[PDB]
Amino acid sequence: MANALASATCERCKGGFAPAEKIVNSNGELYHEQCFVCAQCFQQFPEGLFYEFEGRKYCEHDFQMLFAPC
Ligand SMILES: [Zn+2]
Ligand SMILES: [Zn+2]
């Protein structure tokens, strides 16, 4: 259906992933265990999870400035 889809690839990297180790979903987008970047400073970050959000992701950098304890 729709146009010819290629495959499941990362968002800020488009890396063809699949395993729960390389594939990581949050909000609705797909990320790697080390692609999570700051929608503002684009600062990537390991762990595979930080202050991400729907349609927008952020690292503990811009978000620690806003100061959001938990
Ligand atoms: Zn990636
Ligand atoms: Zn940042």
From Swiss-Prot:
Question: So what does mutating residue 40 to A actually do?
Answer: Loss of interaction with ILK and loss of localization to focal adhesions
Quote the subcellular location field of this record. Cell junction, Focal adhesion; Cell membrane
Q: Domain LIM zinc-binding, which positions?
A: 10-62
| Record PTM N-acetylalanine, positions in chain | 2
* Domain of life, per lineage: Eukaryota
- Outcome, altering residue 61 to D: Alters interaction with ILK
Q: In which tissues is it expressed?
A: Expressed in most tissues except in the brain.
Q: What does this protein do?
A: Within the IPP (ILK-PINCH-PARVIN) complex, binds to F-actin, promoting F-actin bundling, a process required to generate force for actin cytoskeleton reorganization and subsequent dynamic cell adhesion events such as cell spreading and migration.
Kindly state the subunit structure of this protein: Component of the heterotrimeric IPP (ILK-PINCH-PARVIN) complex composed of ILK, LIMS1/PINCH and PARVA; the complex binds to F-actin via the C-terminal tail of LIMS1 and the N-terminal region of PARVA, promoting F-actin filament bundling. Formation of the IPP complex is dependent on protein kinase C and precedes integrin-mediated cell adhesion and spreading. Competes with LIMS2 for interaction with ILK. Interacts (via LIM zinc-binding 5) with TGFB1I1. Interacts with SH3/SH2 adapter NCK2, thereby linking the complex to cell surface receptors.
The name of this protein is LIM and senescent cell antigen-like-containing domain protein 1
Q: Which organism is it from?
A: Homo sapiens (Human)
